[PDB]
Amino acid sequence: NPNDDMPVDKILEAELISKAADRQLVTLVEWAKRIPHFSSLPLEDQVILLRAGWNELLIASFSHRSIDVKDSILLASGLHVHRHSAHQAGVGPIFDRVLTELVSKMRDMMMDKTELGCLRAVVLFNPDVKNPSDSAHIESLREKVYASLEAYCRSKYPDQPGRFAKLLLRLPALRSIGLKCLEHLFFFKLIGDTPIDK
Amino acid sequence: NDDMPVDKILEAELISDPNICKAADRQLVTLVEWAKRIPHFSSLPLEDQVILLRAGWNELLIASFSHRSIDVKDSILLASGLHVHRHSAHQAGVGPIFDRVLTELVSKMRDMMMDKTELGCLRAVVLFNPDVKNPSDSAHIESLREKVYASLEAYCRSKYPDQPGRFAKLLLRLPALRSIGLKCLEHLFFFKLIGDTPIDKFL
Amino acid sequence: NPNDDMPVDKILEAELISDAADRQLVTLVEWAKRIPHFSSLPLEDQVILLRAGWNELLIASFSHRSIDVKDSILLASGLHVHRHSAHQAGVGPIFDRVLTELVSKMRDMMMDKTELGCLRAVVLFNPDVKNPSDSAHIESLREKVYASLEAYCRSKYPDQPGRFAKLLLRLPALRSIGLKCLEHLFFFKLIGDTPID
Amino acid sequence: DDMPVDKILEAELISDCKAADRQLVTLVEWAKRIPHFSSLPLEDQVILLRAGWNELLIASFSHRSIDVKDSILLASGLHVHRHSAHQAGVGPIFDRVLTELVSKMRDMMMDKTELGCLRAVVLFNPDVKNPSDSAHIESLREKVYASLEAYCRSKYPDQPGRFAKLLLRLPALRSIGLKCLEHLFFFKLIGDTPIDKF
């Protein structure tokens, strides 16, 4: 029973996703459904888990996108955001945190997509979420993910004993950075001038 | 007095409110339309007529939707229809502030029967905020504020004569409005209301 | 009619009589007792009000002292902190707000001690502070304070009709500014960092 | 060198107003009693303290509860109440500390050696601002959770994914840590009882 409860090879498939700014890359919900047993979860909890974790799932995603590019974020499309551009925008320190704490640590560690999928899956399955309906159901799914993720680890990377407990130790940083992006100043610094007086 | 009439303010207040969360544009436009109708606001340097909009928009909408929620009981009726519900804003993690809004504004506005002319005067006082950082007029912006509450006192005196402390009661709702504004700003309360549903469940 | 319930003279007295760290015991709780019929309130409500208001109560007092010194907030212990100094301390913008919104405006209308006492008493009787015994009794004392303040403002300053309102319209700034002085970053910027070991 | 979990247990057992200096002291004592901490630059040895003191304290008093109803127990034996924390303006955080940490330390019955290892993981934070070579701080963390896994296997072999949590309790510890600084939670639960009468 390695990962029969939570495939892993199916989590990779979910991962393999191919002038008012906004471009809805909320394909994140297509991803959520493609994660095993998410649609089995109560519908009330499904929307609760996504509303709770959207900001971290997206931040971990583009962090792992810019593993190849230097000192830059690179959004899901081509928007190559630079450090100087961020520091001018007013989102400087938060930009550096994303780099040195997530993309840099992912890069040095050679985190693959099926590891990314599992960390994100663990984020999705948040048991701390408020008023779920079945926290034990959520609890169980999370377990089956990191169980399978530990099994995926120590097989593809058997010479690295504590690689499993290194992937998991990025989540505290993802939590911290996630909060910072939700701050209102962040959202208004990203805008700028406006001076939009008709 | 003659250069800050209560009817023009009441009319401005009456004309306003008879993802693709661009309902936020259908309220930002109303706010600028509303501001222009408040006497002497257009006759004001653009470098002020704009920076006290950026300073006040948050409290202005809270006073609006608070007064707009006197007829509901445990909700916030907003812009166009859409109840939001107590037992729902607590799901969004923004319940505590949702609470002290019903109680500190909606309740106090309900139990006082605050009318649309007073609401408009208070919102107009909030609009002409002389504590803005680097304005142009400064003293003019203040004198405008002064002419609003002068007219608003006179209005309360000539309608609620049996309530001598009526004028002060309205003014002492503003620090609570100030505090509630800071918190609503912090939590993006306004965007959680108009974004609440958008509860698109295509899953 | 006028202030037999909430005498301004007694509130004036309250202000008048209020004339290596290891420190601090500011008992404005003494002042609180002097405010007419404060001790008439329940003991629990007595604590609930002081814990809500202490930061605003004190910060108004420092603003009222610093009227005889430009671009500098004179301390209560006899100190003198300058604008440029607190900007280097990291807490400049907040110092400007205390300087231009409270201090500056208290001087331009020459707020007297009896009025300051009332504003602070209006702050003392916060009816928004939730879970007290009575949410209307503290509001009753609120009403009686500013009832007297208004009457006082008519007598001593008859040619200034909008004065009474001008007084009350400083409270929102006192609210906003007080809230900023309770941020942890604030309390850390004026100490610590390193200042080592 | 090494990272013996029994000595981490020692640190935790030897530990059990500005009088709360008798806890910053208790912290640096515990910290000093951790392997390789004292044997490290004073700069990095104090940067870690500046960074993690808040989380370190929360993980303690959250565990120090458990054997208690709706309250949090401290190093003075004084019970700060849920019925008081709400009246002190920090109710929502209190409930979060209880629900996300205390209740979960209870349900799984975390122990002192496990607690001290998580505290030690927080101590050796490699994401720190300016370390004198983060590699050491990082490696020490690696040696600590290497032992915490080993401990949890032998001590609790009927629950294999036990090591996965404890670690997955750190994201929650961060979000709460951030929220406690913001609210000045720590200072509000040592000053709650100190309330003078007249």
Helix and strand totals (H; E) in chain A = 11, 0
Of A81, A145, A86, A85, nearest to A117 (Cα)? A145
| Cβ-defined contact of C33 to D184 (cutoff 8 Å) | no
- Residue D108 CB coordination number (10 Å): 15
Q: In the structure encoding, which two tokens stand for residue C148, read together? A: 């007297």
Continuous segment of H or E residues that includes residue D72:
strand D71-73
Approach to solving: X-ray
Of A195, A114, A103, which Cα lies nearest the Cα of A150?
A: A114
Asked whether the beta carbons of B35 and B53 are under 8 A apart, the reply is yes
Cβ contact B91–A22 (<8 Å): no
Closest CA to D141 of D42, D47, D34, D62: D34
8 Å CB contact of D195 and C47:
yes
Do you know the residue count of chain A? Answer: 198
Helix (H) or strand (E) holding A145: helix A135-152
- Closest Cβ opposite residue B178 in set C142, C146, C172: C172
Resolution given for this structure, in angstroms: 2.9
The C-alpha atoms of residue B58 and residue B101 are separated, in whole angstroms, by 13
d(C-alpha C187, C-alpha D141), whole Å: 31
* Beta pairing, strands D79-81 & C81-82: unpaired
DSSP tag of C191: S
Question: What are the CB-based long-range contacts (under 8 Å, 24+) for C17-20?
Answer: C18/C61
In this structure, which amino acid lies at residue C50?
A: L
What B69-74 contacts at long range (C-beta under 8 Å, 24+ apart), as own/partner pairs, is: B69/B102, B69/B106, B70/B106, B70/B109, B70/B110, B74/B102
Reference A98, options A67, A119, A120; nearest CA is A67
Which of C162, D93, D112 has its CA nearest to residue B146?
C162
What whole-number distance in Å separates Cα of residue C8 and Cα of residue C117? 8
CA of D191: which chain C residue's CA is closest? Answer: C51
Are the Cβ atoms of C168 and B164 closer than 8 angstroms?
no
Strand-strand pairing, D79-81 and C72-73: unpaired
**Closest residue to D174, CB basis, from A101, A168, A176:** A176
3-class SS of residue A82: strand
How far apart CA D116 and CA D119 sit, in angstroms, is: 5
| Whether residue A93 has a cis bond before it, omega within 30° of 0 | no
C-alpha to C-alpha distance for B1 and B26, rounded to whole angstroms: 32
What domains can be seen in chain B, in order of their start residue?
Answer: 1-203 (1.10.565.10)
Rounded Cα–Cα distance for residues D139 and D35 (Å): 13
Residue of A1, A108, A175, A181 to mutate, interface with D, max D Cβ within 10 Å = A175
Helix (H, G, I), strand (E, B) or coil at C81: strand
CA–CA separation, B194 vs B201, rounded Å?
A: 17
Query: Closest Cα partner for B6 from B161, B177, B124, B134?
Result: B124
Q: Return the closest-CA partner of residue B58 out of B199, B163, B177, B166.
A: B177
Q: What is the distance between the alpha carbons of residues C105 and A140, in angstroms, rounded to a whole number?
A: 61
Give the residues after which the backbone of chain D is interrupted, taking a C-to-next-N distance over 2.5 angstroms as a break: 16
DSSP C117: H
The SS3 assignment for B135 reads coil
User: What is the crossing angle of helices D42-64 and D21-32, to 10°?
Assistant: 110
Query: Are A197 and B50 in contact (CB < 8 Å)?
Result: yes
- B43 burial level (CB within 10 Å; 0-12, 13-18, 19+): exposed
Residues B194 and B78: their CA atoms lie apart, in Å, by 8
Cα-only R_g, chain D? 17
Q: Which residues of A lie inside 8 Å of D (Cβ-Cβ)?
A: 100-101, 122, 128, 142-143, 146-147, 150, 161-162, 165-166, 168-169, 171-176, 179
**With an 8 Å Cβ cutoff, are C128 and B171 in contact?**
no
Cβ partners under 8 Å of residue C65, min gap 6 = C74, C75, C76
Q: Please give the sequence-ordered ranges of beta strands (E in DSSP) within C26-173, or none if there are none.
A: 72-73, 81-82
B106-132 burial: b if 16+ Cβ within 10 Å, else e: bbbbbebebbebbbbbbbbbbbbbbbb
